[PDB]
Symmetry: D2
Subunit: 249 residues, 4 copies
């Protein structure tokens, strides 16, 4: 049938951007989708788009940095659809731009709490549900900056590195428990947030991608979909680039 | 719809093991498939199975280590089907088992010729054809041993590292010429091959089992399709966690 | 001549284990050494040993996880010796042993605070001082678990990956400001810590033994010296081959 | 004493460049040094410089791509100084510049034979001598291009990747045989060959190094020296960058 038919999938930060594209891919492939976001209007709109494709979805408001919200979100998924098969830990921020020496303590803490700690809180409660329902598959949203530096964004690079480590650890630990965990590392993707950067800055970013363009959110979602499906059944603890060659040079 | 419908795909060493699984997946997804192998019977058998699923496939006998054979194989694909869209460089051998100091000069050269030089010969002629076609996609078959050692198989490990480097170079070079190149790194896979050695192998995979050729083929398919359009120059493990520890 | 003569060096967690070995090597090579630790007796003991070799050393009590303590430690170094040339961010803990699903919220936060956030707090204030001095060198203590998993220690593995990322960022950012930053990745090291578990650990190192803290310290020394002048943003294993397989 | 006192060290391609700098470092540190190169005049000059520092050295002409020359070179080292403790497999060429599709078959073969096969031939005969004399230490000269692409130099990138694999394999295999093997990955280094590139091309290279300059041969030699000494006794099968941050971004 459709490759995610009969599965229940959760996407954090699915109000916008990559998370939106992943939630739509999940919906189109027959998953029952739980949308989570800080922004309710964005989240409800994602639900409405999935429903308008003929999929099934619900919205639950949660801050990814809160342990209690992550626990509650998994609780809601299981209450609503009876199980949790697939989680995409996508919620994240870019953070302030400053050299490491000048990086604010609060700005640091915020990036680490959302982009790193929050991914762990998600995984922890997701794992608990997945163990109950016979296993599952987690996709953690990392970055190219999980492996290469992003000057002026030390907290982002550090957090995305930490997500790659966490992913390896979960994959290794739950190998024989039927839970797989993998990390996706996108290059620079054309979002609305990108339209806020200056055009000169955008050309420079483009020049760093051998493919000669920015990526699209749908192109990342294709990889997430794969890694979320049964097709990727021998793939766990891995890190998978979608970067137009950025890390190849 | 079939994700490779109307594509022309070539798989090297597609008479058995992973290459067979790749050719079958390509065939199932509607590609016209060129099977290449040093063993005609195996290759002919692969063609027959694709035909029995209702796909289209031809066999061309070739030694991967030979530049002329690679050029002739690609020439054959373009002549028979009008173009080349997809190539999987799969053909390889394990080589003799010896410590590096004891590795025979002839055994060394044979593994390098098939597993390293041959992948380059394939890619070179594949690229040439794809540029005439307006682009294409290559998947190179590496290994976990493209990133971690295989004691007693230094030639294999070296050649599989080389394939990763070559892949990065092609992906970076042809980014704006609409050719993508990626490498797949399988863990140990259950194929016709001592049970204590097998248990030692399984113990190295956190997933707790050896992989299946079909599991490898799924990743190759994804990487050969337009779904992977923003992926190039990358190395993609299918190893049940082997390299994560 | 002494390769660190007249340099001012700070080592975190230098009351025992690798940090002690690093501080001793720094002391032997003529640095003025600031010892930091949460345990005063251990720290005071380290100072005494450097003094008995004829080096110069002071102790400053600090919790690595605290931003104020890190700023005060660096302030202390600059006040006592006039400048900061070298820093080694070594302080870390192993954390509780649990599967990720079972990892306690408090245990998680403690490991992240010391091993990840604390290294950043150290680097931030160290960088500030070094820029006033016209440059400097940082060595961050990562692990093999900055690149491969440690089952039951997900917080440790995550934090050690973070340290590698931070190191890359600092090295890249301050390349033209004469500050270098590199990370060291030790394998399992013989320190005061079940013999079957120990044998399992040794079996994972191709060299066939656990490392010694002095072996780790030698690499840190090289990376702290002017001999490593073209090395920055790099991750450097000292692991008896652990990550090569 | 001097850190390589009483050791016998071999450097291939020590007539010029990095190999020259490594041979001088070895000599200054009290090693007995065997210089090998295709160019006799260059090689004899290196010997003369080592002797003028008060070191001991001899020259033996060998093509690194020949198994017989590598065997003979090790034979000469052992005949002359009684043993072989340290080998630096440095001989290498840059190769032609062409896209992979356009890369010549003969140009490919030549780069692979010198930069890769020749390193194996060296290691093989070095290992044989080192096993006889109770162990030793090999340093294989790789590149940044052992891990990242060099567009237009596919054979070089491929070969340098292969050297990293070979290194890991030797380190793993001989761990308990008292032979260590490690690979050095230099960024772009100021050689005379570099003066043959155009100045615009040189600025572009510089811009790719965060440190904001090209490297010096002496800076690579310092790392090789370390990895050749007893100080690096717990380091084997590793890959060690000297790249001014090139691979960090
Ligand atoms: N170029 C790129 O956009 C790029 C590249 C690599 C990686 N990524 C990663 O992709 C992920 C998605 O980013 P995006 O580009 O789609 O950004 P975006 O800002 O378009 O989408 C982020 C979404 O996350 C939500 N969110 C933010 N903080 C949250 C929190 N605490 N709890 C819940 N929801 C929260 C936002 O409201 C928003 O809907 C992030 O993890 C980012 O690091 C993006
Ligand atoms: N455990 C695994 O099986 C494993 C793991 C990692 C990577 N790989 C890689 O997967 C690829 C396929 O191997 P496999 O396991 O399916 O082995 P296999 O021996 O079953 O299949 C290899 C095929 O290649 C053919 N072949 C060999 N040399 C050839 C040449 N010179 N020219 C043309 N055809 C040639 C053989 O006849 C055979 O059909 C290889 O590149 C191998 O290195 C395999
Ligand atoms: N097998 C190994 O020992 C091994 C392997 C890889 C990496 N490492 C890393 O090496 C570093 C040193 O560890 P070790 O093996 O020497 O362990 P250790 O426990 O012997 O030494 C660590 C020291 O840090 C101090 N310390 C701990 N938390 C502190 C804090 N918050 N503030 C200040 N001081 C604090 C302790 O009192 C102790 O003196 C750590 O970062 C560890 O993660 C160790
Ligand atoms: N920017 C750089 O220069 C750079 C960067 C990274 C890696 N490397 C590597 O460093 C090594 C040394 O290169 P270099 O920059 O000093 O170049 P170079 O041309 O200055 O020195 C190379 C030396 O090797 C000798 N040689 C060449 N082929 C030989 C053969 N077949 N047998 C014996 N000797 C031979 C040459 O005669 C010469 O003396 C090479 O392996 C190169 O790939 C250099």
């Amino acid at each position: 049938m459709k490759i995610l038919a009969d599965k229940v999938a959760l996407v954090t930060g699915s109000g916008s951007g990559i998370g939106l594209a992943v939630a739509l891919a999940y919906g189109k492939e027959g998953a029952k989708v739980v949308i989570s976001d800080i922004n309710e209007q964005a989240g409800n709109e994602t639900v409405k788009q999935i429903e308008s494709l003929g999929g099934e979805a619900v919205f639950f408001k949660a801050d990814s940095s809160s342990p209690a919200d992550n626990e509650a979100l998994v609780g809601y998924a299981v209450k609503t659809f009876g199980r949790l098969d697939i989680a995409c830990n996508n919620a994240g921020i870019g953070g302030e731009a400053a050299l490491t020496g000048d990086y604010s303590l609060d700005g640091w803490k915020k990036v680490i709490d959302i982009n790193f700690n929050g991914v762990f809180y998600g995984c922890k409660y997701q794992i608990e549900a997945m163990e109950r329902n016979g296993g599952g598959v987690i996709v953690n949203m990392a970055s190219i900056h999980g492996t290469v530096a992003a000057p002026m964004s030390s907290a982002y690079t550090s957090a995305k590195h930490a997500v790659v480590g966490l992913t390896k650890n979960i994959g290794a630990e739950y190998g024989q428990k039927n839970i797989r965990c993998n990390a996706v590392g996108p290059g620079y993707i054309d979002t609305p947030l990108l339209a806020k950067l200056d055009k000169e800055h955008i050309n420079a970013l483009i020049s760093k991608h051998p493919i000669g363009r920015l990526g699209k959110a749908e192109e990342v979602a294709e990889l997430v979909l794969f890694l979320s499906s049964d097709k990727s059944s021998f793939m766990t603890g891995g890190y998978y680039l979608v970067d137009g060659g950025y890390t190849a040079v």
